Design a protein around this nucleic acid. Structure first.
Lengths: 199, 93, 74, 121, 107, 97, 77, 96, 84, 106, 92
DNA sequence: AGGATGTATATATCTGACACGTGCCTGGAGACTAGGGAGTAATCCCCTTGGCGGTTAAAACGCGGCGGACAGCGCGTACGTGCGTTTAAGCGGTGCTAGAGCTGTCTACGACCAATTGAGCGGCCTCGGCACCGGGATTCTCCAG
DNA sequence: GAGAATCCCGGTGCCGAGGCCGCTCAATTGGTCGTAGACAGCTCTAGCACCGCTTAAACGCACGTACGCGCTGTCCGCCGCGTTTTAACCGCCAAGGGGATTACTCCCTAGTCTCCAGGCACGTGTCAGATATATACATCCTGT
């Protein structure tokens, strides 16, 4: 039930992918649907487009154009697991293929300020696809609604301070109680390596 | 004596949350009507909630339900909490 | 583990305890710095009264939290 | 793969009530043993929750995952303790059931037992 | 008789509790009012007032002024997402409008 | 001489008036309009000052909202001007007959 | 006839605060009609409230109540 | 091989459905939908038989009332069909 | 002592049903993308009503949503209902 | 004897039940004596109007009863009752018939 | 033991239209109608009696309430009917 | 790419609105008693969830062809911009009766308690008005001339 | 001028409206008592009608440049009809959770004196903000 999607191919390359899929006789997709279970990225390094980040977060293959060339040459079905972009968008597939939780399973986020380099709806969609939840008011570290939360956060390190404190303020003293403060760089890096890197 | 207002009580909250600001005269009128609106709404809802179930008093649970009905989103889950705190400091004295 | 306690007059007192103690010990530590006798104090945390005879970790208290203190005289 | 209105497949209904020959036929005929329902449970989960040993044995003998999670991140060992059983705990532990995984509330399986031998491990 | 300690002080509040009681009893809302309702009402009202006056002062300090005029309350109210649906049928006096020009009118 | 081309001073007006707070309609003609309308339901009416001020404020708010809705409707149909059909459609969707 | 006190530039200024850029030529009469209807309703309710209590002076609270009866609360007074 | 031309069966269906009073939303799916959302908010609920019918009536009246104004907005721009832009203008002008 | 749930059920409100509702509205020609928008609007409305209904129910220490509760909810929102 | 209060006022709607409902519904401290004899008449007049206009349309369709469709047809054609009941939905009713003037065939 | 205005509607219908009847799914609508109008009128009268520092809800309150709620033409007929009823009652 | 108009900075100065202070009168607090509304246990029986099955009305999939939506180019009049002329808004004075608030008596109207009796509610029960089904009549549309 | 679809006209069957009966619980009559609301009467804040002037804003005319509105082509998106596959609707039986009433005992709230501190009207004064000034510099056009 293979599907297809593109993340930076060329127009001639786009027509080539269309013809290759037609030879494979599979459904294509322009807008990012849920069942998009194959993504083709042009270069040889995981880019920072919205589509590739959604792809690594939902969990599927990230293959390169060499596979496209090989499919065009051999004209056969496919040969996977030889051109997957390694070192970081691979632990995601291994995590989804063993019935484990998602990345931010048990975290809470709050966005505040003016965002210029990146929009807001994109980040909100990334958060709600990861597995966490979004808040609507600022988490002051002296109110009852913040102190009465008992939710350990999986995927953290073995024994650290990111296991009992699971609330974040994100903008564009570093730990006062159970609330952090972090810049957007840490977020967008955390997504493209599949690990909650500390501080 | 004459007409009473809520102006001696807004200044204190202001001085507690922001220690270097004052407030004008018309803004005080705005803040003085904003309280009466909310008061009347909450009381009017509690009355009918007491009238449906054939009860005859107004207790704390009626106010809790009145608040949860007419405050949207995440403003309920905060306000309720605050309220509870007060009552617990009251019965313990 | 440091712990904040707050009094109705608008003050903050700091304490240092371990996560296996009992409320009586906390009241004793409070009396060691405040002056009020240990027979008239009542503590509040997250909208519920605390009894004397249980451990702190049973009520899910961790580092850097806040308790409220109320007297019983008037 | 015509699922039910709750998410349960045929293996689920087979497991929730021990019918071993039917499960044998269903497995030999071809049916994936790792398919979650709308809540997140798996066949092994219900098998170990209600208390039929032979079905857990049969499921394990066909490459089913042993530390999968579900609702509120509860492992099979969590239910095997919270209800109370003897054989399945021994079998699972012999197979490699993690005894240090944690659930969303921050508790370990040892914290959900009553028996002396139960608390012994 | 002992020294008097008011009811607004035992709860740690700043709004009154006598006034709310009296207005709830002589306004014909029910035939008898409990002894724990005024404290709840006072707490809720105080929280709302604090929430609005905290957001006003930020926009006050933005334009480099040290007071609060109605334009600032209008900005603070209309720029939040939950405080807007509660006050979605009120009009402030001497206020104004948010800046917004449609994107198919620019050069 | 030196002119600006059509479509530039309008943007300047938009930027200016969306930043102040003063009242737009003049003050004495509104008073006279209110008195002449109300002089058909009684005979010797007298008005305070806060009354005419409040009426003026509410009227301005109403008209500004109406014009915003009209502008949205006009842009919806591949134009830039506004015309009577837009007012009629806005007021008929709102529910004021 | 006193509806002509609402002149042409006044309507243009209100339109500008709205967000429009080009106005047509037959837009003014409709504006005057809408304004007349609105004012008629509000003033009638206010005069009823006033005549009830045996007075002869329309005060501010009367207009506030009249506006409240239709969903135009108007804090401020 | 007789065959009508595009535009006549629609008018007939309009005339037929505007002169009859009956629900047209296939009850059992609607019941399951209400139970799903209710399961979201609380746990282990159970409904009477009248609650579902009341909800059905209200949620049909709402959609009919929306589609009328959608059609008006669509006619306003020299077209005959409705697209997913008219719904948004309607909901915006209304106040939701 | 497990717990089961329900999901992905907005697909029972199929295509011809939306067409019949549109016919009773007054339209004649329908596009091919109105369906998702219609489903979204319906879900939002139903959520906003059922929340208040369940709050009323849970106040009186009951466990079954009755017919008067939906009426009180709909009157809270702004649309009354005669018949029950 | 005992002359009831609703029969010495010419009405048909009750007058005592309204008195009890005004006195024990928390609307004011005291309710006067001429308070219900007005509410009763107003309610009676409004009901008579609606029922007459409904029965007419019921007769104009060759039937001898009143089902909800007839009330729905009698409300949305009055131009003065449509304003008082504008945000109301009658159960098991319908909608008035009208097709627009553009979508008709040439 | 529930209450309902299900007997008086019959009398009014019997005196305006002689040979007709009402189905059971059409009596509930009249019930709800009467209750809603009652609530509106009484509530407005209460608010109007409270905005003046007074404690009795007399007949002038109901007059002003009717004159505010109901639309244009219906008001004159309603007020005339009520006034006739009250004066006949107080005459005897 | 200079030339010419707006908008933003920076610094003088100056008038009227905000923040603090002090007698003192009305409403909140402590201490006590008498009666009825609501919290808590038991127990009868109405109505909601969970299964099973045969039958037939709606939903899902596909195809050939026509009417409508979206992008082009070509005219002609209605509205935007800068000037010099004529109307009446706004500011600041002063004189003045009409009507809103307050106060002090004194009487006609409604809450409250007791005793006696007809209207309106629950249940039975039987005949007419409506729902469902087959058959000729007449109206309305499309290809063909 | 033919096809499909809609309106009348009997014709049989079936359950829900329209009457009717005992009896129980709220509406009617006949009394007294303590207090709101009508009605004179005097003091003084604020609204209506005038007058002169200085200057900001409403009226009236001319020119030329986008924008509204009516045409004429090209073709992808949606309506109508016939065959096949899925799950709503109806009638039926069985087991057990929770909605409606009924009693009995106790704790929580209205109703009254008394006295002491929190909040309102009235004064007097100093500083943040509104105005006039020179100018520093950030877009908008037309020529080449």
């Amino acid at each position: 039930p293979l599907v297809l999607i593109g993340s930076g191919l060329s127009s001639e390359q786009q027509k080539m992918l269309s013809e290759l899929a037609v030879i494979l006789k599979a459904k294509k997709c322009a807008e990012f649907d849920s069942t998009v279970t194959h993504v083709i990225v042009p270069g040889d390094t995981v880019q920072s487009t919205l589509k590739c980040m959604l792809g690594i977060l939902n969990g599927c293959w990230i293959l390169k154009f060499e596979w496209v060339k090989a499919c065009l040459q051999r004209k056969a079905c496919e040969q996977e697991e030889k051109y997957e972009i390694p070192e970081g968008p691979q632990r995601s597939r291994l995590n989804k293929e063993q019935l484990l939780p998602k990345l931010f399973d048990g975290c809470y986020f709050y966005f505040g300020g003016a965002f210029k380099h990146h929009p807001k709806d994109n980040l909100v969609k990334l958060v709600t696809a990861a597995g966490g939840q979004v808040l609507s008011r600022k988490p002051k570290p002296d109110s009852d609604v913040t102190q009465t939360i008992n939710t350990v956060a999986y995927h953290a390190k073995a024994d650290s301070d990111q296991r009992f404190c699971t609330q974040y303020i994100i903008y564009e003293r570093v730990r006062q109680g159970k609330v952090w403060m972090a810049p957007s760089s840490w977020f967008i890096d955390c997504v493209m390596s599949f690990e909650l890197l500390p501080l | 004596s004459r007409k009473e207002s809520y102006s001696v009580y807004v200044y204190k909250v202001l001085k507690q949350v922001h220690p270097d600001t004052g407030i004008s005269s018309k803004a005080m009128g705005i803040m003085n009507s904003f309280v009466n609106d909310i008061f009347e709404r909450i009381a009017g809802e509690a009355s009918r909630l007491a009238h449906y179930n054939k009860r005859s008093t107004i207790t704390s649970r009626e106010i809790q339900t009145a608040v949860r009905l007419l405050l949207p989103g995440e403003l309920a889950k905060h306000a309720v909490s605050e309220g509870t705190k007060a009552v617990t400091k009251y019965t313990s004295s | 583990m440091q712990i904040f306690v707050k009094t109705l007059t608008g003050k903050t007192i700091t304490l240092e305890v371990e996560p296996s103690d009992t409320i009586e010990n906390v009241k004793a530590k409070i009396q060691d710095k405040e002056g009020i006798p240990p027979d008239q104090q009542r503590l509040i945390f997250a909208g519920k009264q605390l009894e004397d005879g249980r451990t702190l970790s049973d009520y899910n208290i961790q580092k850097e939290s806040t308790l409220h203190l109320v007297l019983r005289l008037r | 793969v015509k699922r039910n209105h709750r998410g349960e497949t045929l293996l689920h209904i087979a497991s929730i009530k021990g019918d071993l020959p039917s499960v044998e036929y269903l497995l030999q005929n071809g049916s994936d043993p790792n398919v979650k329902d709308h809540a997140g449970w798996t066949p092994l989960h219900e098998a170990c929750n209600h208390g039929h040993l032979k079905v857990v044995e049969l499921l394990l003998q066909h490459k089913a995952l042993v530390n999968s999670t579900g609702y509120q991140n509860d492992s099979p060992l969590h239910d095997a303790a919270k209800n109370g059983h003897m054989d399945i705990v021994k079998l699972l532990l012999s197979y490699g059931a993690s005894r240090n995984a944690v659930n969303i509330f921050g508790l370990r399986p040892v914290d959900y037992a009553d028996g002396e031998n139960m608390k012994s491990l | 008789r002992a020294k008097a300690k008011t009811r607004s002080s035992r709860a740690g509040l700043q709004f009154p509790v006598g006034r709310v009681h009296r207005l709830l009893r002589k306004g014909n809302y029910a035939e008898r009012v409990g002894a724990g309702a005024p404290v709840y009402l006072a707490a809720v009202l105080e929280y709302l007032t604090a929430e609005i006056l905290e957001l006003a002062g930020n926009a006050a300090r933005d334009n480099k002024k040290t007071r609060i005029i109605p334009r600032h309350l209008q900005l603070a109210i209309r720029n939040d997402e939950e405080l807007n649906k509660l006050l979605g049928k009120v009009t402030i006096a001497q206020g104004g409008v948010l800046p917004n020009i449609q994107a198919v009118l620019l050069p | 001489p030196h002119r600006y081309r059509p479509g530039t001073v309008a943007l300047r007006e938009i930027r200016r008036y969306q930043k102040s707070t003063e009242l737009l309609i003049r003050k004495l003609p509104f008073q006279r309009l209110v008195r002449e309308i109300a002089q058909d339901f009684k005979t010797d009416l007298r008005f305070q000052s806060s009354a005419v001020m409040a009426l003026q404020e509410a009227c301005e708010a109403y008209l500004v909202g109406l014009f915003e809705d009209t502008n949205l409707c006009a842009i919806h149909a591949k134009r830039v001007t506004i015309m009577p059909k837009d007012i009629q459609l806005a007021r008929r969707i709102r529910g004021e007959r | 006839d006193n509806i002509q006190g609402i002149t042409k530039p006044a309507i243009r200024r209100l339109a500008r605060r709205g967000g429009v850029k080009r106005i047509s030529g037959l837009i003014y009469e409709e504006t005057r009609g809408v304004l007349k209807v609105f004012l008629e309703n509000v003033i009638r309710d206010a005069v009823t409230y006033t005549e009830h209590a045996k007075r002869k002076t329309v005060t501010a609270m009367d207009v506030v109540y009249a506006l409240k009866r239709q969903g135009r609360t108007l804090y401020g007074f």
